[PDB]
Design a protein around this ligand. Structure first.
Ligand SMILES: CCCCCCCC/C=C\CCCCCCCC(=O)O
Length: 131
């Protein structure tokens, strides 16, 4: 949709250390992971949507079509088979690799974006503010 379109800045994070931990990320990447206030820039050109995560430490851009499947390289070097769906105001995301699987849900709450990350027995909640 749109409500997503714009520039968002990280404001609050919760249980991210364990989300990473649970992803298999090692100490190094984690100290950095924890210490960052990323900026996300969702943009739409035609039917291709872009999600861009910027931080001093690392960048990440992804271009998808809702419904269609795509190959995404994570910020942690993983090579994933992701799908992005629109279900009742939230942009759910599915990442599959090997036999593992993680989900990222982006919902709009009081002009805030609430990012919910689940990885088997683990949820982390990162809040973002617009602009
Ligand atoms: C939040 C990505 C930028 C962090 C840089 C440090 C390297 C990240 C290590 C593991 C990242 C796991 C993927 C994070 C998903 C969060 C998505 C979002 O917050 O919009």
């Amino acid at each position: 949709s749109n409500k997503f379109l714009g520039t968002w800045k990280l404001v609050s994070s919760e249980n991210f250390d364990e989300y990473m931990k649970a992803l298999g990320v090692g100490l190094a990447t984690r100290k950095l992971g924890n210490l960052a206030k990323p900026r996300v820039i969702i943009s739409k050109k035609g039917d291709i949507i872009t999600i861009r995560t910027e931080s001093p430490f690392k960048n990440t851009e992804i271009s998808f079509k809702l419904g269609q499947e795509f190959e995404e390289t994570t910020a942690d070097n993983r090579k994933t088979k992701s799908t992005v769906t629109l279900a009742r105001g939230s942009l759910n995301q599915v990442q599959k690799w090997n036999g593992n699987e993680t989900t990222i849900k982006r919902k709009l709450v009081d002009g805030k974006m609430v990012v919910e990350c689940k990885m088997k027995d683990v949820v982390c909640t990162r809040i973002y503010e617009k602009v």
